[model samples]
Target chain A: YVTTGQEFVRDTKYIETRITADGRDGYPVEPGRYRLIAARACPWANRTLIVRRLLGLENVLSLGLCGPTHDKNSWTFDLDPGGVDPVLGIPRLKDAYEKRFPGYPKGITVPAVVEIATGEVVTNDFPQITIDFSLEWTAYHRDGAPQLYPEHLRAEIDEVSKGIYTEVNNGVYRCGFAGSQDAYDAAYDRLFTKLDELSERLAQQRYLVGDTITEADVRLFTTLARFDAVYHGHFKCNRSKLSEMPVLWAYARDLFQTPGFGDTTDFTQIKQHYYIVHSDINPTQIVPKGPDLRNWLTPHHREELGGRPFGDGTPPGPPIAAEVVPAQNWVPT
Target chain B: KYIETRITADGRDGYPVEPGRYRLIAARACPWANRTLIVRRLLGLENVLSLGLCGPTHDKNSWTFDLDPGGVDPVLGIPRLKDAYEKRFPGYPKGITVPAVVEIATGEVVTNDFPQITIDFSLEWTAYHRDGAPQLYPEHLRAEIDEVSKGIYTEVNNGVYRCGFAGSQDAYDAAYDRLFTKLDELSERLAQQRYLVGDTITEADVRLFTTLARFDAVYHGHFKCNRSKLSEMPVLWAYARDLFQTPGFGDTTDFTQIKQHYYIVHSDINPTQIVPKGPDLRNWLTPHHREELGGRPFGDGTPPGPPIAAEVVPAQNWVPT
Candidate 1:
């Protein structure tokens, strides 16, 4: 049902590994050795962005952002000057994938790590990449990097993150892309039921697990951030938006005001990705001008019901020089 | 004034309001025609003047009863109002407008002029009117009412249409300037008194209220006459609310019909014909508390009873809530 090739890239599969200081996957971690290629449009890519910032991975893995919408073949470096990736010297992401495995059949996806020296795609498994930044890359971790995936809380984080992925994150797509009404109904029911349960769970706690920022919070925050802006209306997941519910709205704003979460979001790119790329849903491709974003900044008051966002450690520094949200694109207050 | 034919019980030129004799053909959408509906309700003349509503939309030449069963007027058994007009005048020169009184027996149009129709209903149809019919056109007020009504008709009543339908910017600008100027004068006059010309409800008040009721809902937005919305203006908005809180005024209004008629029927102005679903309607029913001003709606008489069963507003409309 995807008319454009970029949507297919979203479902493409790839190798999952982490090259750490301890050589966990038989590859050693070193600063300036890996290139992180992510598209601003993809929410999956945004999870990696938040984790990279919180853990201070800028010096070790440099970033390249693909433009919001892409053409038939692959995500391109269109936002760059002269429409070419300066560091990689390739126009399309498929170049690196093809160099690694010549005549690669799968669609090119983002949040792919490429070895800087060889220009080869090391891995595009997004979930494992961020988890490795938390656990495996301990030598490169900043002085203020909070313990996002503590060993004692890993079991609960895994369980909660899996449920959020199945019902809220991927469930929104299942409803939007379903070929039949029965499939849509099933997906919609699970999505809101899970959200209701999550609301109840969050009513008592600040973070997802043990009153601290964890991997579970980062995974869920990206999907919740997009819920009101894109998925709720455009995807027809209108059982309710994140803003319509009380608990989740406050929880989301709590995360949004946090150092790393809201900085990674760009709504213009998010809207263009869905409305223009998914032709089956919106054939005319007319973008709606509304659902004002100014309300995001208005007194969430989540800080009043306090639990430290970054436990003992301080908030992460301002976004790196290359990764800052453009001034004009900031959500209006 | 104008030498216009009018229907009356005295049978002037053989036209009268009698049971099953005359059919009042009015499109709910037309403001000129809507004035007659209010008068008919106030006088309790429903059984005497049988009402036939034409659909909102009309063609370039005239309004057609396309919304009637099989797209024909049930009483007259014709497709268009022009058929009845043609039967009377044979080669009628003027436009076919409503608040028309048609002789049901002959199927000939009696009168299409609005000014004469309401005045005749008061002066000529005295025999059939309900006991509560107030002195709507009292002898002392006639000359003054005539003079005030003429100014409102030229500068405010037809002024809105002139602005909306003006072919050039200069014509539209002249019409818009005159309309607001007249409204400002009217607001200043209404500040001290409850009603327009007197302490009691007059024919002059009925003439002005229909245009003001429709100002914010349709004309302000659709006609590009948006200097400011009526609700934004204080004295005029309160003056409108004073009349609207009364029985005969607000109950006669159908906002859904009013909005649909302008936005959908005027395809030239809105080519897509997509009706805007906003400007919440609940505000109309709010307590205006205009009774503090303390003036009788019907003067010495009481309200002209509740609306008839056939004439009652639909269930899904703005009722007290």
Candidate 2:
């Protein structure tokens, strides 16, 4: 029912041709050939949304956003006019995925890229897609796009990212969906131990990898952004809240104040997705009114550290016309 | 020395304890009334004294026997204790007090005075005394007992109430000073003796014990007398526990009923009447080892037998499971 440019595969048996700058897989450094489809409600999707904006890939890879809530069938283009994606001309994003391969059996996850002309999904592997945009799509990158995944920091970034993914990002899901008390307790202890270690580490530095923003910072920011608002109260991870600690609050706020990062965040959609979709957690489907949002804009004062946010490059421009943040729904003081 | 007001068999027109005679009306909620219950229990004067229990709550005038089957006192056939007082004197002044003895046949109040009633039970109610009633008010110790009891009465006994109900800043300030001063003094004195008067228990211990039992449970929190919790102070907490773990002292208490009486009844103090459910009571029953100090609970006699079926502690209390 859906069309994507990427070739479909079943059971992890498929061709993966890396598109490096050296034309290692025979496709290199070309503009206007790819499209990025994402939803703001998903943290995985928000990573790509932030990286694409930060790298100035807006011109080369056209972006499409599905509205917050989605049914079992697919994330639909409800945000577009007449319930049709203006660019893709499809009602459901699953239509694009299914058109590439008939009778595909797998989860339809977001933060996917597709070829613009062929309308076939390129890759839904979220981790690799952002890294390729940083490394491969360099010729069309805006002159000011920060080197998010610099070569010198790749070794440390990979080590830190693997630990963060295992303990903090996926760890929260393991705690929330645990089948037994032993599983929950193990997940809970590991999550807090890692968070305590992160809190101690961040006391010394402003960013994860270096003085500049890196791929590791982008990966961790999305999960920390949702920690207090949804995870702490709903998930019963009550060892401590993110804001209650000093170090992590400032780190989260620094990212929130950045140009590309805070612009793409939609808290209402994020809350709606978890509370409405996970019927096991919230049987009533009634979202709570609070866990106040006014505290976010208070002074973080990370500027006192005197580290460059963009590092010898200019910040990204204002959000594009189609992706502007809704003023009324934004977290207000 | 005993603060004794003698109400002789020859009626002096005021206070008397005669046979075939008076009804003693007391409330289970009152510490003063609780003293009378323990004393009457110890002396075995049940048939002669004939007790009436007023319900826990009361209005400005007097306590009422509302817990009775038809909300009327079966013996007096009156709804309120004020009716008995009104029968004797047309308009008696001052607030009505419990541990009052009333003439049963005439249905008129004899006395609402508490200090006189307990002394009369020890002295005059000889015929009704049980086979082995301990001499709670011996003549030799009466002088020391009265002197000690008077100081305790002025400071700690009525001191907590004075602090709670003081109408002015100066009154409350003076009461707080006097209360802690007496507590400091008692802590020093109790460090030496096992009991208040002599080696054995006396009327003085019965008098002071009831007030201390309620100090932490209600007064410390509700009365805003929060210099420290009773448990925080070492000597008094042990002294209170010593008495609490004793048979007659802890057996008579009903914490749920006691809390209800204060928080609910005193609407002027607590408008909401929501009782707090904390400060666990299991610690009270823990071994205090006060018995190691070596003094007889009952001098030259045995402890009283188990309380009667009607007088046994309610089943759901902190007693044995």
DockQ for every prediction shown: 0.05, 0.02
In the range B46-126, model 1's lDDT, one tens digit per residue, is 867788887777777577888768889887889988888889878887888787888888998877778788888788877
Model 1, runs deviating above 4 Å: A1-12, A17-26, A180-182, A239-241, B1-321
lDDT of 2 by residue, B31-131 (tens): 88888878887777775777887877777867888978888898899898888878877786656777677788988777666776787788877667878
**TM-score for each predicted model, relative to the true structure:** 0.58, 0.51
Query: Residue by residue across A152-224, what tens digits does model 2's lDDT show?
Result: 9999999999999889887777665554445656778888889889988788788888889988989899998
Considering every candidate listed, which one attains the maximal lDDT?
1
Q: Please list the C-alpha lDDT of all candidates, in the order they appear.
A: 0.77, 0.74
TM-score of only chain B in every candidate structure: 0.92, 0.90
